[PDB]
Design a protein around this nucleic acid. Structure first.
Lengths: 145, 154, 131
RNA sequence: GAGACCGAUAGCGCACAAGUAGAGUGAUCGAAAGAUGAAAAGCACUUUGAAAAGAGGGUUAAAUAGCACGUGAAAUUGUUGAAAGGGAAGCGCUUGUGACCAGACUUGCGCCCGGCGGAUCAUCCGGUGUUCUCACCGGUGCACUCCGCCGGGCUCAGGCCAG
RNA sequence: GGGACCGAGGACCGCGCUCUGCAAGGAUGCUGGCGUAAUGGUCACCAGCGACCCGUCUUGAAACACGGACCAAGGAGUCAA
RNA sequence: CGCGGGGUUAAGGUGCCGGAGUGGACGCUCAUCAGACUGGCGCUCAAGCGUCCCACCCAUACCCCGCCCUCAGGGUAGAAACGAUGCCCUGAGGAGUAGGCGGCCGUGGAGGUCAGUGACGAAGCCUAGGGCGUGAGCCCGGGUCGAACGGCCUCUAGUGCAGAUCUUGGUGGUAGUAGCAAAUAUCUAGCGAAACCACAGACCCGCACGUAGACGUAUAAGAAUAGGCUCCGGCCUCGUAUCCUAGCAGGCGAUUCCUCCGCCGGCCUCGAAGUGGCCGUCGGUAAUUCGCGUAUUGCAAAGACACGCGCGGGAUCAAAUCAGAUUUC
RNA sequence: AAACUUUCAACAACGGAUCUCUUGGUUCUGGCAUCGAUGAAGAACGCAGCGAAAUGCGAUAAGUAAUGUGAAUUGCAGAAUUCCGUGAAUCAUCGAAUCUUU
């Protein structure tokens, strides 16, 4: 956890509703986590204030960042943005997004999913929906998302 | 509590290292201190104009009275010297960091030398002792500024 | 009402440490006190403006010796049986879990000590709260 | 075959290339030097370049364990941040300023009603072990007594500092 | 009459008195304040006062002299009769 | 001469440095380097000298209280409300080289024990963290780390370092200096020691923050001190004076006054190190009298806006240093 | 202003202390008695695919024979070499041999 002040060259957020970039959620547990993060925010973002909240899942670690952006023309020494699995993003060649951090940098890792409000509040045999154990990360290529 | 100033993103920086390099530690340290904080192309031109003789390197801490010319007027130091080999090693590490930034996907026209550190390497056991060094430089991109949007009313 | 006992106010005659003479100048000299043995050593002769030496007049009151600012005395515990020895001395002693005690044994000690009414100085050790 | 021995500046000069490397015409003199990881799985491949070198990337539980390898002190050095100074610095006592850190008593008991459930309650029954008169089980029920739990009501006791 | 500093002890016992209880073998009573901080600590700096460089040796005493670039490890009243 | 708090003194002092009297009575002394119960500044009806009187300042000294230790005296069993090697009461004392005695801390290993800690993390190390002890030291937190370790009662010793022109290893200033020398006549590349060493001689984007001592911090000739002021009546030891001083940290509406203050323009004034007067505009204005609100802050101890000082980049003028590079409000 | 000097903190160096380990040393105790003209101790030169060191061996040269065990050796390369066999092995035992120059 680092507050916005700690980040060098940072900004102050406004009251606009941000837009969500929930990236790389494939597992049903990951879909549940993505939906749980999605319901916390309003569905319609105020696009006048270009503010983006990013929750990017990589190898079970959810990196949370918050930026403000601007769609600018590329400086003539910048390269065109490379697309995923194939270069030359079609349509935005020469157009690039400038980003400035306005929010905290944090890292999350889903540890437990419970039916009710914590362990005291979940009652039946379906009390805990999911529990993280270290033995599930015994292999470095096994991810729960 | 107090939170330390977090590091810049690894997608916005490029690091180069050189270890157990056979150049003098003091001259390399002074050369690295001269180019510290500059833009990348300016440092390229300065080191290439100190490899072939036009421009001077001032010495402040490890300063030996060798030359006193007008080339130290721009630095305010009356003692100025021209190390050559340290310039070649710094040039090699600078193009190494340029290749690293090009491979990573950074704009190479807005690269600035965030930090350059010269540490002492183990001494060469041959009473005459050699003084090798380690060099660790980190280039970053120029800080980008985004214009805000006006707040909405409620 | 649960605190330490009623005790006389804790008075420390000196809060600073007695540093060894010339130990701030030499890195080979630790700051632990060594009595100067030289004849002309002005610390030993007690000249004005020099270091004081430790004396028995600096001693603490016997009713508040070994006592923490809370009023309890520290009692080092390594297991649950050790905190059980403070059943009848909950107001005079506080539990200090040893540095080499594992996390689960620390949880056992903290839980029992709370039930016995014994304060734990290092209860914020390698444990955390789960809801 | 052993030891109240020594544990890599120790113990034989020598835990390892040790009477070796090396010195002296010769007789002779004579070192320093142990530890990756459980397993080499000892870093493929892409990309700088001429390096006993890097950046990505990979193996591994871990590579800030990469044959400079367990841990990794101090002297001494570099980068960043803060403060002070230019006719010495350093120390003792006492406030102040700035920054950082901690977090004070661990904060309780007793009475009065109503409901519920257990018992050491029932001169209830049966069983077990005993120090043979004390404990422990199983089954009955709430007339009395005693414990708890829940909902209300009240009183009291509480750590430190000022006037 | 005004002011300062202090409150050691911890059931009763004693000497007493102005004796329904008291100023008589050591402070209680009332009110207020205290947890996004009462109160501490560490580092750096400034400020007021103070302060000859350590060990050894000689001399009535000084004064000279000797040793001290720094750090780590080793390092000297032992064992027998 | 234990560690503290308060009070009072000794010797010595009370012009400043310097805490405390420019204290009081009586005389003397002007010295072209007086004199000081002077150190410097400095002092002359003293801050010098002689006597006398009063008040004041502060030592680890004296007195009262608290606390530590030591010594001494007393009490304690058909046992105690604490290991009789324990506890309780009382009094006095506290410098210290060579030297003597006692207690206690720490290190390696051994026997016993803690049914001790530990891969859910031992030992070690680092640490602008928290405690305990007079102290040697000990305990805990945070980080690193990866296989052993600790307390207690006894036993045992190759058991505690600041120094020995100490041993071994590592690392410095000198110093990128002297010099290019064995090994590996100047300037500039590359290489590179040794002696010695206790310490020293105007805009555009983004970001950030708001007093060596104010509380009425008001007051202008000079000149003399065997005289000055003045209204020409007179006045003077006395600045123990003059102005100003009311309202929610100071509101509203009146009644009522043209009195005061403040801001801007005109007329002039101020140079010595720069300012005030007059007029005019506007705003406030208890000299007098009221109706409203001031409370539970309960007996003294984090919102918005505006204005500034700054930065990190961009280009805007005017210049400087070395058309083209850097820098400056 | 900037530069330099000093102190503190984080990180990165230098260096190899501390901790833990140990196919080593050291001291004690017990059984036993065995070098050489049938050529000893010692010195030298050679022998392997890659052998730098160490070790083993001697032109039968990292060894031959005999016995025993029973399926390897091993860093890389090679074997049509051996697996119900008188038979692998950088194996052990060891009574037969070979044993260059000194």
């Amino acid at each position: 956890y680092a507050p916005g002040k700690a980040i060098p060259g940072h900004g102050r957020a406004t009251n606009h509703y941000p837009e969500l970039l929930l990236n790389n959620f494939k597992t049903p547990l990951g879909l549940l986590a993505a939906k749980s993060m999605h319901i916390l925010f309003p569905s319609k973002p105020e696009l006048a204030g270009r503010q983006v909240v990013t929750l990017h899942n990589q190898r079970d670690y959810i990196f949370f960042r918050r930026h403000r952006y601007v769609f600018r023309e590329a400086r003539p020494t910048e390269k065109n943005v490379v697309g995923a699995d194939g270069k030359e993003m079609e349509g935005v060649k020469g157009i690039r997004a400038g980003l400035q951090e306005i929010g905290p940098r944090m890292t999350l890792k889903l540890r437990r999913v419970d039916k009710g409000v914590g362990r005291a509040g979940s009652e039946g045999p379906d009390a805990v929906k999911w529990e993280w154990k270290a033995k599930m990360e015994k292999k470095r290529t096994r991810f729960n998302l | 509590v107090r939170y330390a100033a977090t590091e810049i993103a690894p997608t916005k920086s490029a690091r180069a290292r050189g270890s157990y390099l056979r150049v003098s530690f003091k001259n390399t340290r002074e050369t690295a201190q001269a180019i510290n904080g500059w833009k990348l192309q300016r440092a390229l031109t300065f080191l290439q104009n100190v490899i072939d003789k036009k421009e001077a390197v001032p010495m402040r801490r490890y300063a030996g009275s060798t030359g006193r010319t007008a080339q130290g007027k721009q630095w305010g130091v009356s003692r100025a010297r021209w190390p050559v080999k340290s310039a070649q090693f710094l040039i090699g590490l600078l193009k190494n960091a340029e290749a690293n930034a090009d491979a990573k996907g950074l704009d190479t026209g807005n690269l600035i030398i965030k930090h350059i550190q010269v540490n002492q390497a183990p001494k060469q056991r041959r009473p005459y002792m050699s003084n090798p060094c380690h060099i660790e430089l980190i280039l970053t991109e120029a800080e980008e500024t985004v214009q805000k949007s006006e707040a909405v009313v409620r | 009402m649960v605190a330490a006992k009623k005790h006389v106010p804790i008075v420390k005659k000196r809060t600073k440490r007695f540093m060894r003479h010339q130990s701030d100048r030499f890195k080979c000299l630790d700051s632990a006190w060594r009595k100067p043995k030289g004849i002309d050593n002005r610390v030993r002769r007690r000249f004005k403006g020099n270091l004081a030496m430790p004396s028995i007049g600096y001693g603490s009151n016997k009713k508040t010796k070994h006592m923490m600012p809370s009023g309890h005395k520290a009692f080092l515990v390594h297991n649950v049986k050790d905190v059980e020895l403070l059943l009848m001395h909950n107001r005079t002693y506080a539990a200090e879990i040893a540095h080499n005690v594992s996390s689960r044994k620390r949880i056992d000690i903290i839980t029992r000590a709370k039930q016995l009414g014994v304060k734990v100085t290092n209860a914020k050790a390698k444990v955390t709260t789960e809801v």
